[PDB]
Amino acid sequence: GDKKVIQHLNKILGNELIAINQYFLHSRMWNDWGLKRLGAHEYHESIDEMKHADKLIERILFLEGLPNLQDLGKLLIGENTQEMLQCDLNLELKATKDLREAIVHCEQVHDYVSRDLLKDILESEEEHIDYLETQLGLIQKVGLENYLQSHMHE
Amino acid sequence: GDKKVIQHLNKILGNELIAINQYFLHSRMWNDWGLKRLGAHEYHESIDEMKHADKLIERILFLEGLPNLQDLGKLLIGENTQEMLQCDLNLELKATKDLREAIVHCEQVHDYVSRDLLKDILESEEEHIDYLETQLGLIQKVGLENYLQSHMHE
Amino acid sequence: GDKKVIQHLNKILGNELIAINQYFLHSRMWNDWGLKRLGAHEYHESIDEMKHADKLIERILFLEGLPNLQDLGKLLIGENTQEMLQCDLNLELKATKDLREAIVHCEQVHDYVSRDLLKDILESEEEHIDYLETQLGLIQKVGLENYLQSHMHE
Amino acid sequence: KGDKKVIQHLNKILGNELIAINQYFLHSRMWNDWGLKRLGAHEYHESIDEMKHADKLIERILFLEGLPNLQDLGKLLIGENTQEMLQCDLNLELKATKDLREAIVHCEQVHDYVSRDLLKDILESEEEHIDYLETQLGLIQKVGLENYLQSHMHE
Amino acid sequence: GDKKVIQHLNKILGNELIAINQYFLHSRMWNDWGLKRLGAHEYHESIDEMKHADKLIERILFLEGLPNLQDLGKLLIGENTQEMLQCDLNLELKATKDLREAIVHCEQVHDYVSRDLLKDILESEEEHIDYLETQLGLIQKVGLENYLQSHMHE
Amino acid sequence: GDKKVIQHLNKILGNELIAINQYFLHSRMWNDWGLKRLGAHEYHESIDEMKHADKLIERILFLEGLPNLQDLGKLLIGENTQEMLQCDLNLELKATKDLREAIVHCEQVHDYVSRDLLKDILESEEEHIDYLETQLGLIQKVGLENYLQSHMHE
Amino acid sequence: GDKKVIQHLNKILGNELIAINQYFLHSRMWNDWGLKRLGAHEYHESIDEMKHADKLIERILFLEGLPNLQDLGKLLIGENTQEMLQCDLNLELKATKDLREAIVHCEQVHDYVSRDLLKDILESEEEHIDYLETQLGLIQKVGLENYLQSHMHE
Numbered sequence A, B, C, E, F, G: 001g002d003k004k005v006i007q008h009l010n011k012i013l014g015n016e017l018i019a020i021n022q023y024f025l026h027s028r029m030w031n032d033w034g035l036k037r038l039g040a041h042e043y044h045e046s047i048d049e050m051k052h053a054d055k056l057i058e059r060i061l062f063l064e065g066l067p068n069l070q071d072l073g074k075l076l077i078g079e080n081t082q083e084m085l086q087c088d089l090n091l092e093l094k095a096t097k098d099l100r101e102a103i104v105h106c107e108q109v110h111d112y113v114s115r116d117l118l119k120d121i122l123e124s125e126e127e128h129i130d131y132l133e134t135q136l137g138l139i140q141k142v143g144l145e146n147y148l149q150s151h152m153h154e
Numbered sequence D: 001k002g003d004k005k006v007i008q009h010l011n012k013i014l015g016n017e018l019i020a021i022n023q024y025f026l027h028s029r030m031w032n033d034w035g036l037k038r039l040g041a042h043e044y045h046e047s048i049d050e051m052k053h054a055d056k057l058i059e060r061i062l063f064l065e066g067l068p069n070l071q072d073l074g075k076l077l078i079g080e081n082t083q084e085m086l087q088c089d090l091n092l093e094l095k096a097t098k099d100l101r102e103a104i105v106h107c108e109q110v111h112d113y114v115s116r117d118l119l120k121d122i123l124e125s126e127e128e129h130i131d132y133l134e135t136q137l138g139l140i141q142k143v144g145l146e147n148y149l150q151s152h153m154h155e
């Protein structure tokens, strides 16, 4: 395994570890508030990041690297829906930037299978950014109270 | 086939081509904004127009004319939901005036089969006018924020 | 969204718009002549270009560009089977060149998801080029009258 | 022959059902025209329910050898928005319900207990409708008109 | 919506409302007399008139008129079977004339969709006339008592 | 029933009776030569003219006219496939001229039900003309021998 | 194929063409009068004649003769039920006579397959005569009015 590919994979893994926990807490926060539709969506976002982290770990081990599950960066926990959403979007913009940089490096050292893995994850982060931006646009078009209302029942 | 009948059929065809693209863009714009119910409905109007164009094209060829799929008129693209709906309405008002003129002419040269085709297309356009007026009317009764909220989910 | 990426996507979109109409007319002309297998095949090629255009449109909007459905370039309509197939082929040869330039660009600016979309479109257009070259060669191998005979029934 | 005054009361109730049938059917269609499909559908079923009540009256009248009267159509109360339409329906049912009660008292007095029974079933049904109508009007006040109509766009 | 179109639709509606009541009473009369087959058939006629009225009402509201369900013309109630049949027949010959006049006017102002609705209704009144004349002929061919006997059982 | 409407119905009916026998005989001549796909198809054209004659007869009778089945016009019988197709084509062009004339007259005396019937019949005859011109066109494009070959098996 | 056999076959065919039209118009007259049971029975007799004419056409073509579908003999149309049934019988007595002579001739020149086909047709015409004589019998036994009453419903 190329040494820097493995550092980039561990970096992306560290970003997923953060998103897993952040999305999971935001999910349960929305469930505690009775916003059950947001809560279920956010749960599914968290599970998706668990699956990404799984593939990164398996790839790092195959490359005879040491996956790092020990270092957990900073969770961005919001205190209301508008902020929680904005916090997910800020995490995703950072994650996406780290992914692009990992993919440049993989391309450069001809690790095309790691690059393919990272590109599938990048596509799924960009779908999430699409979700998030649409939600924040909806809060402006329908009003915050209507937006929350629409997210009470599953 | 009557030469003028064929110009009228191409005229109608040209108008369907415009509505296909306009409704199709308006659909995808609504989806992008998270108003999926509007997006789904408008997708279906686009497909309906596709199906009318197909039958125009087939009639023109049976009559031994040359279907004109080269000339694309002006799309009326809205910038928000009330504009988009009004744009679609303005386009249907014009399509329907053209459909009436074509039918007058078909009757006068006794092309009753073209006439009947055009009559089915008109009745469908009039149902879309019905839908569109009703939507603009709902926006006034329930208010724009409610109207949008009601179209967030399919 | 990168502004040159978006311009490339609109350029590809413009090519798909041309292909959709050209193939659709070509399908209906073949059906008008009783060459129903050609006609059904070209119908499916048209529908495929429609799906590509839809994905291009969704991507542009996600990158916050303006999809351009207004500008419709030159349709190459043949007047017999051999010309129609050659027209479709000339069109794909140009479509495919624009796709390669567009991918080079998306790669350079790290828009790997756009690259991925374009690469799928490209695979689908190279499949269409395989079919076209194959039909041209069969005309030579079995003679035009037999070729056409073989395409009367679906 | 049935009792003459019974037959007159039955034709009276029948007159009230003919009005409700037309009024409810027009309100339903106006609600559908406006995209308030859920009000449209419910009101349609109210019209249909009155059509069935009218059928049973017509049948009973003929059994008692009277002449069902379908020629005289009293005055439709047509509202011009949703709150008005619900209040018009309600005004009609308050009146229908008073007439049913008088018709039932007469039936008892002349021992036509089968006619009483038919009217008691009509009455229960018209009282349900009154429950529905006052509930909607109460909901307009609790959730606000705009929300209320919003909740009735879709079936 | 054309003022005289609406007036004509509202006149056809008036004829439908008379027919609903007339056919319904007549059904119930035949049932009270034990001619259940006649009763069942007249019940179905009534129901068809109620469906035509529904369509007229919906068309009037689309054209932005006021449906008139207030004025109720005069029911032709028969006192025996032969008379009940002739009465429905006189009423149908009238409806049929008014429909023809409504259709002339629709044609002349190009309200072709109203015309097509009117034509469907008219086709259905002509079927009812076929039935009614046939029934009157049968009374002469088989005699009244046999005709009535034949209509006792559903 | 309008007297001239009835003459026009009888005229159309006579045309149908000619088509029934001509198509039927053409069918059985194709079966006898072992061109079964032509034979099957022509059989179905004959059945269809049988259904049209049925509808004309019923209408004529309802209008109190006398259906004329006694007079049978001149059958156009070809002696080979190209001639048979052209004969069927010459017959349909005539039927179709007579249909238009009958429709003018029904419009002018307000028999809109007769007109609807004839109009269905006219659309079905134009579909037949489409099929016929396509076959003669295929003969030229694939060559007579290939065209017949392709019609050997059902 | 023997020349006089072909003449006979063409003669029987001609009789079947008269029956087809006569029975079919009778059926539709009975349906127009509301005597649906007679109408359905008579419809099936017309269909059976159509099938016989098909077999005659087929055999004539096989034997290298020209089926004659051009020369339609005289239709016996009754004005009422008893006449209509007597006209069918008169027609069948004549048909039956011609069949006998055709069969003598087939036998004499040894065309035993032609004789078998005509024998099958004869048996079916004799079944028809049985039905016809039975109906005329019943008219006498149950009275005309009862007879007609029993044929209103199918």
Ligand code: HEM
Pocket: A017, A020, A021, A024, A047, A050, A051, A053, A054, A069
């Ligand atoms: C490295 C950290 C984690 C990894 C790699 C991980 C991985 C996974 C995987 C592969 C699944 C199966 C998902 C599927 O295929 O449907 C899963 C499920 C799940 N995870 Fe995690 N997970 C992690 C952390 C967490 C945390 C911190 C929580 C909660 C605080 C959590 C809660 C859940 C729940 C509730 C499920 C569904 C379990 C069930 O009911 O079957 N996970 N995880």
Ligand code: HEM
Pocket: B017, B020, B021, B024, B047, B050, B051, B053, B054, B069, C020, C021, C024, C047, C050, C051, C053, C054
């Ligand atoms: C000449 C212009 C066009 C014609 C004649 C046409 C015709 C058709 C027809 C006949 C269908 C099948 C619909 C059905 O029966 O269900 C269809 C489907 C479709 N069209 Fe078009 N169309 C046109 C332009 C477009 C454009 C500009 C778009 C933009 C994307 C588009 C997008 C689609 C999509 C997504 C489908 C459904 C494909 C599937 O998933 O099966 N079409 N079109």
Ligand code: HEM
Pocket: D018, D021, D022, D025, D048, D051, D052, D054, D055, E017, E020, E021, E024, E047, E050, E051, E053, E054
């Ligand atoms: C005039 C007094 C009327 C009576 C006694 C009457 C009676 C009935 C009855 C007994 C039914 C069957 C309902 C069921 O069992 O589900 C019915 C159905 C119906 N009625 Fe009426 N009706 C009347 C007037 C009207 C009028 C004025 C309209 C106006 C449009 C109307 C519209 C309908 C419709 C649309 C149906 C359902 C028909 C179907 O699609 O099956 N009715 N009526």
Ligand code: HEM
Pocket: F017, F020, F021, F024, F047, F050, F051, F053, F054, G017, G020, G021, G024, G047, G050, G051, G053, G054, G069
């Ligand atoms: C040459 C004269 C005719 C021949 C040889 C002929 C032959 C046939 C045959 C073989 C069938 C299919 C019957 C079966 O197998 O079930 C048929 C059906 C039929 N024919 Fe004729 N036919 C003739 C003329 C007529 C005429 C004058 C009429 C008048 C209307 C008519 C009306 C019909 C009808 C209604 C059917 C049933 C079609 C369906 O709906 O499937 N035919 N004919």
Ligand SMILES: [K+]
Pocket: A146, A149, B146, B149, D147, D150
């Ligand atoms: K709300």
Ligand SMILES: [K+]
Pocket: C146, C149, F146, F149
């Ligand atoms: K060949």
Ligand SMILES: [K+]
Pocket: E146, E149, G146, G149
């Ligand atoms: K009897």
